[PDB]
Design a protein around this ligand. Structure first.
Ligand SMILES: [Mg+2]
Ligand SMILES: [Zn+2]
Ligand SMILES: [Zn+2]
Ligand SMILES: [Zn+2]
Lengths: 248, 48, 192, 67, 117, 144, 124, 259, 46
RNA sequence: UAACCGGAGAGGGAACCCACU
């Protein structure tokens, strides 16, 4: 264990082993139950780890390198599935990294964790700490094919927007943007923030015993001066009560 | 120990004498604005 | 105030029409890079059949890598000179760089003409694998593409190999920035 | 989770057009032609009738624990 | 957290009035009329009518800040002629013009439902 | 009680500031001594700091989520000395390389370059629109 | 509510704070009724070399006018800016994606052509 | 020194949108015409949402947002009603408001799509636009939970909110062949033609005019369906008259105070 | 005076007095919820 | 044959990790 490997095609001659019959069953999946493990059993593709990758020669493209032309080495043994598969979870949603700069790609891939959106499906039930959820999530207009493999079509983060590359007013000198008040009124990027609290009451050996109760000004002592009308009889705020800071 | 309590970066000599906590000091993100002169800064009402 | 209002009336943008060039200069770039590549293959074949005479003061390997670096630097400089000669004088890239606000004449060259050779630790990209920079190339080859020279532009897009090489360069720049900031902070504290 | 009622740029009414869009895609038209048949000329409305994702079917697939 | 309520854009409160006046000292016969809680949708057309007037030498309009609903107008007209009556004359000329647009637009729309054909 | 609310001369009032007051203003790390400048405070509705690009240029400030610190001196003599020493016109120019450090930001720089291009021919309405925003304007139109 | 001062992200790393907010009458507009949402920085673009962002915006306009989800796989090398400009000419718009904008304050056309189009943004 | 004689003609009329041309007027006046369409046209929109009991998974603030963004029919009762902020009455009165009700209990196994049709109105002249096609969806309700609410609609304009903005879209332009040369074309042949352009296919660029003004403004007004476009234009012009009259009276009193 | 609570998985209503085990009356389920307040709520549509 | 009383300071800390500059 501990070796890291990735699947790669097996090619013996100048021609590959991934045949039209196999892609026909793979296209007619979910009926024949033709699996990736069934493909591995067929031996078209195999797992290749680091030392073996060191000692083997690779064919970058069957349509371009394994095809007969001015030969480079003509001793191709393994072939990559797809070059974009060298990317990761955030680089997958990064569009046009072959056009972008590497510091920009690294920055965007880091910012993908800050990319705010509908994080889980059952967020109303799942009561977590510091949750964020947007009103109107949308899938991106232009993307790679890998996003719907990463389920980005179902739980995306953000809105396709009509931007204007220009310098209009001059309130956007350095890394600044101007926005539509009317659209933001209409629902543009309006999100909502969730914060959860907790409390564990304790029972001890009668020296100090904690019990959930509405405090009383004359009875209880050491109170901080605030309102308590929103507090119920037991000592719990009911749902649907508007409340601001410095309140019980 | 006290030797640690003073030789630390949070120690008395550095984290409490050379640099110490002060009030009367707000902190927030900024926003470009060219319509005011170079000598002026605009602040929020809650800060003020 | 008044320059912001004049800019408000005027308008200033950047676009693909500003970033694109013409086919005749594109063909000039392809001819230049093809000439440079066949020249460096000639030099490599010269070293293979050992007609290469080593320069005094360094080994044959150092002389060969100096020759390769000289050829690639000359080719990249000619490419940049050709592009900056043909920037068509309506490019907002040209206008803003002439204003001196941001960017550089070489940045037009990477975004338009060619990325060029990227260097790690002041040299070409070493043989991380068994005498090969990548398993995608054969063993014991010294091609500029296989060693870290980019034959394409940002507008043209990059192969994944040279994209990996640009990642090498960007990571090298970022680690330099981090250690630079930390060490200059400590040194400034020492001086104070 | 829901289709916005109005275009963020324009303000054209969108809410009925989502269910109409689903009806036409079940009637098996190409989605751009069905969008034009519904009559959304501007791309800033074509985007929201095109690339809207719905989550409320999953949310209602969850059981109502607050009854 | 500190959002301006929307009526701050248009509602004039107690203590301030719509128009204030100041006489300029840099050039004589120059007056500054400050309009409160209103914007370029009137500023532009008032300066259009002032440019239509040839009796003014200098005209000017500027908002002190976009988020501060206010505009100032500096007008320097020819001597023997007064900027105040110039400004009122320009406004009432614009009023008569837009009224004429209004009845012309009624007769045009009525022509449309009766049929241009 | 209003008996307590009654005032006489010589008392101390912890009062909210208005426009004109002097405040010091910085960004950690203070790499250069130009990185903390005095400024006059002013009030705007939306809740963030508002400032100039000519002050961002020495601040190494570029608005990608960078937040500034703002200290206000309490003592009047400290306020006066901050006003008269650390103020931006008083320290336009650095000593280390005897060069100006305020500069002109990129967008206005490119705009003024295209404005100072030779072939600029500006309409009367636009010149009319422009010459209010000169603070030091004499008030007379120049010859076209 | 999205106020000014929030942080907004492209899919290419251009961090941008919301400066100010103007009304719909105040933003510029095209010959048709489209009004934009974001005004990003044409000085930021050449420094960061976000030609990927430019191609992303142009492909987004093409895919929006076409009626299909665009594909932006990196190492495809089967589609390029020439084919995208061909699709733009097919759909009747300008070859290089620039258009004419109209001032919301004065009403005069902007002297320069202005780039416009959809993309994907995220607040942070 | 005095106003010119502008001209108005209309090409075609449709319920959703109208198209017309204006000539012999200033670009500033035309821009203000577009802005007075956008901003200050008063219509009726839902404003006060009281919620008795919500058990939908959508939250109450979201429900109020969509209710406010529902459009309504505001033919002439918007002109009859007075502003809520100015009308002296306890809370909202029927002279300055409209009452709405929405009670939905999804008791069926299928999801009951709450629609704009189900809003019960107090005045027949005001309904959702869709009624008098598919209705406007509000919230999809699962079986078991319900939503009970009361609402009041008032009169506002687009300086407040885009929900009180009734114009779906304005297309305002001029000079279809850049004869005034407001723009400079590096590649005018590559620049596509406008639909109002009359230049040749070989030229596609009108010659520069040394002496001229921008003229012949083309207008395409697309309503959201709440009002007829002609009524929208008349209301905008009437509000412009009222605002200029108020400015005249106030500044005349300012002059009287000065003298 | 006693609180009106909702079991959750039963979706049922029950009455709970203070200092009592938090269990459903027919199933004893520990996940347990409180009902909406009776105090009025309004929202302006902004 | 009885007369104006008023009450606001706070409570840990220490470590690790993440994020941002
Ligand atoms: Mg920074
Ligand atoms: Zn739209
Ligand atoms: Zn009333
Ligand atoms: Zn139970």
């Amino acid at each position: 264990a501990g070796r890291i490997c990735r699947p790669l095609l097996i090619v013996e001659k100048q021609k590959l082993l991934l045949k039209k019959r196999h892609i026909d069953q793979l296209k007619e999946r979910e009926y024949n139950n033709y699996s990736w493990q069934d493909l591995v059993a067929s031996g078209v593709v195999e797992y290749i780890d680091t030392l073996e990758e060191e000692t083997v020669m690779l064919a970058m493209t069957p349509d371009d390198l394994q095809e007969k032309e001015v030969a480079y080495c003509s001793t191709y043994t393994h072939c990559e599935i797809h070059p974009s598969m060298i990317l990761g979870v955030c680089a997958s949603i990064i569009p046009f990294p072959d056009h972008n700069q590497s510091p920009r790609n690294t920055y965007q891939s880091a910012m993908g964790k800050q990319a705010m959106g509908v994080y889980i499906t059952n967020f109303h039930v799942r009561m977590d700490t510091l949750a964020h959820v947007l009103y109107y999530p949308q899938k991106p207009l232009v993307t790679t094919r890998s996003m719907e493999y990463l389920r980005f079509r179902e739980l995306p983060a953000g809105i396709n927007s009509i931007v204007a590359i220009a310098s209009y007013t001059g309130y956007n000198q350095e890394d600044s943007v101007i926005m539509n008040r009317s659209a933001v009124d209409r629902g543009f990027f309006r999100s909502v923030f969730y914060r959860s609290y907790k409390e564990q009451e304790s029972k001890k050996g009668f020296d100090q015993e904690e019990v959930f109760e509405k405090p009383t000004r004359e009875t209880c002592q050491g109170m901080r001066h605030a309102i308590y009308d929103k507090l119920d009889d037991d000592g719990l705020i009911a749902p649907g009560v508007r409340v601001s800071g410095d309140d019980v | 120990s006290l030797k640690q309590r003073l030789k630390g970066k949070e120690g008395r000599v550095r984290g409490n004498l050379m640099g110490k906590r002060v009030d009367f000091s707000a902190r927030t993100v900024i926003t470009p604005d060219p319509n005011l002169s170079i000598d002026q800064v605009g602040v929020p009402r809650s800060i003020a | 105030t008044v320059i912001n209002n004049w800019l408000l009336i005027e308008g200033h943008t950047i676009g693909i029409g500003d970033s694109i060039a013409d086919s005749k200069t594109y063909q000039d770039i392809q001819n230049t890079i093809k000439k440079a590549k066949q020249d460096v293959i000639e030099v490599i074949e010269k070293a293979h059949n050992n007609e290469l005479e080593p320069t005094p003061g360094n080994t044959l390997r150092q002389t060969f890598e100096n020759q390769v670096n000289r050829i690639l630097n000359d080719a990249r400089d000619k490419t940049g000179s050709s592009a900056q000669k043909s920037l068509s004088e309506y490019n907002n890239f040209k206008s803003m760089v002439v204003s001196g606000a941001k960017g550089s004449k070489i940045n037009i060259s990477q975004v338009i003409a060619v990325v060029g050779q990227q260097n790690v630790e002041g040299k070409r990209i070493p043989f991380g694998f068994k005498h090969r920079t990548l398993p995608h190339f054969i063993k014991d080859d010294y091609g500029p593409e296989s060693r870290g020279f980019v034959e394409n532009s940002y507008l043209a897009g990059l192969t994944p190999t040279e994209f990996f090489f640009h990642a090498m360069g960007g990571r090298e720049g970022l680690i330099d920035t981090a250690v630079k900031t930390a060490e200059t902070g400590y040194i400034q504290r020492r001086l104070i | 989770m829901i289709i916005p009622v109005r275009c963020f740029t324009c303000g054209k009414i969108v809410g009925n057009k989502w269910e109409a869009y689903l009806g036409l895609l079940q009637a098996e038209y190409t989605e751009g032609d069905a969008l034009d048949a519904l009559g959304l000329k501007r791309y800033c409305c074509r985007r929201m009738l095109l690339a809207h994702v719905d989550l409320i079917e999953k949310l209602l697939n969850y059981a109502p624990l607050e009854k | 957290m500190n959002a301006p309520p929307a009526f701050e854009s248009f509602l004039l409160f107690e203590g301030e009035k719509k128009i204030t006046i100041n006489k300029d000292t840099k050039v004589p016969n120059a007056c500054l009329f400050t309009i409160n809680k209103e914007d370029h949708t009137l500023g532009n057309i008032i300066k259009s009518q002032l440019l239509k007037d040839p009796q003014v030498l200098f005209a000017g309009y500027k908002v002190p800040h976009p988020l501060e609903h206010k505009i100032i107008i500096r007008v320097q007209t020819t001597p023997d002629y007064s900027p105040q009556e110039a400004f009122t004359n320009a406004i009432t000329d614009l009023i008569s013009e837009l009224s004429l647009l209004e009845e012309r637009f009624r007769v045009a729309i009525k022509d449309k439902q009766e049929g241009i054909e | 009680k209003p008996s307590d609310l009654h005032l006489q001369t010589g008392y101390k009032v912890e009062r909210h500031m208005c426009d004109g007051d002097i405040v010091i203003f910085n960004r950690q790390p203070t790499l250069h001594k130009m990185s903390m400048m005095g400024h006059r405070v002013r009030i705007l509705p939306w809740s963030t700091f508002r400032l100039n690009l000519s002050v961002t240029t020495p601040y190494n400030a570029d608005f990608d989520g960078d937040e500034m610190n703002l200290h206000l001196p309490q003592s009047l003599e400290t306020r006066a000395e901050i006003q008269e020493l650390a103020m931006v016109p008083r320290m336009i120019v650095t000593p280390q390389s005897n060069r100006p450090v305020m500069g002109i930001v990129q967008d206005t720089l490119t705009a003024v370059r295209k404005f100072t291009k030779r072939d600029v021919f500006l309409e009367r309405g636009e010149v009319m629109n422009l010459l209010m925003f000169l603070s030091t304007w004499d008030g007379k139109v120049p010859q076209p | 509510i999205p106020q000014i001062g929030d942080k907004f992200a492209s899919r290419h790393g251009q961090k941008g704070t919301c400066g100010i907010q103007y009304r719909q009458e105040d933003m510029p507009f095209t010959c048709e009724g489209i009004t934009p949402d974001i005004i990003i920085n044409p000085h930021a673009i050449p420094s960061r070399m976000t030609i990927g962002h430019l191609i992303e915006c142009l492909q987004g306009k093409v895919s929006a006018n076409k009626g299909e989800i665009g594909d932006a796989t990196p190492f495809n090398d089967a589609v390029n800016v020439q084919k995208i400009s061909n699709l733009l000419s097919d759909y009747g718009y300008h070859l290089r994606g620039n258009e004419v904008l109209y001032n919301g304050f004065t009403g005069r056309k902007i002297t320069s052509q202005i780039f416009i189009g959809p993309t994907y943004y995220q607040r942070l | 020194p005095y106003a010119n004689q502008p001209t108005v003609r209309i090409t075609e009329l449709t319920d959703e949108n109208v198209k017309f041309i204006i000539e012999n007027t200033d670009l500033a006046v035309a821009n203000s015409i577009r802005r007075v369409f956008i901003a200050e046209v008063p219509i009726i929109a839902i404003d006060w949402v009281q919620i008795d009991a919500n058990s939908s998974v959508l939250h109450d603030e979201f429900i109020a947002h969509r209710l406010g963004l529902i459009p309504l029919t505001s033919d002439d009762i918007v002109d009859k009603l007075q502003y809520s902020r100015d009308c002296t009455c306890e809370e909202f009165c029927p002279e300055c408001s409209v009452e709405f009700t929405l009670d939905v209990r999804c008791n069926e196994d299928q999801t009951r799509h709450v629609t704009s049709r189900d809003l019960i109105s107090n005045s027949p002249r005001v309904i959702p636009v869709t009624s008098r096609q598919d209705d406007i969806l509000i919230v999809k309700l699962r079986k078991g939970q319900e939503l009970r609410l009361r609402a009041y609609a008032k009169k506002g304009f687009g300086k407040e909110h885009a929900k009180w903005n009734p114009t779906a879209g304005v297309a305002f332009e001029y000079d279809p062949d850049n004869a005034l040369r407001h723009t400079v074309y590096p590649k005018p042949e590559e620049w596509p033609k406008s639909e109002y352009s009359e230049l040749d296919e070989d030229e596609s660029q009108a010659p520069y005019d040394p002496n001229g003004k921008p003229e012949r403004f083309y207008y395409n007004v697309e309503s959201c369906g709440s009002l007829r476009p002609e009524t929208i234009v008349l209301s905008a012009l009437s509000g412009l008259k009222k605002k200029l009259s108020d400015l005249q009276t106030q500044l005349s009193h300012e002059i009287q105070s000065d003298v | 005076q006693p609180m009106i609570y909702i079991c959750g998985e039963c979706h049922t209503e029950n009455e709970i007095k203070s200092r009592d085990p938090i269990r459903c009356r027919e199933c004893g389920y520990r996940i347990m919820y409180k009902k909406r307040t009776k105090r009025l709520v309004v929202f302006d549509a902004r």
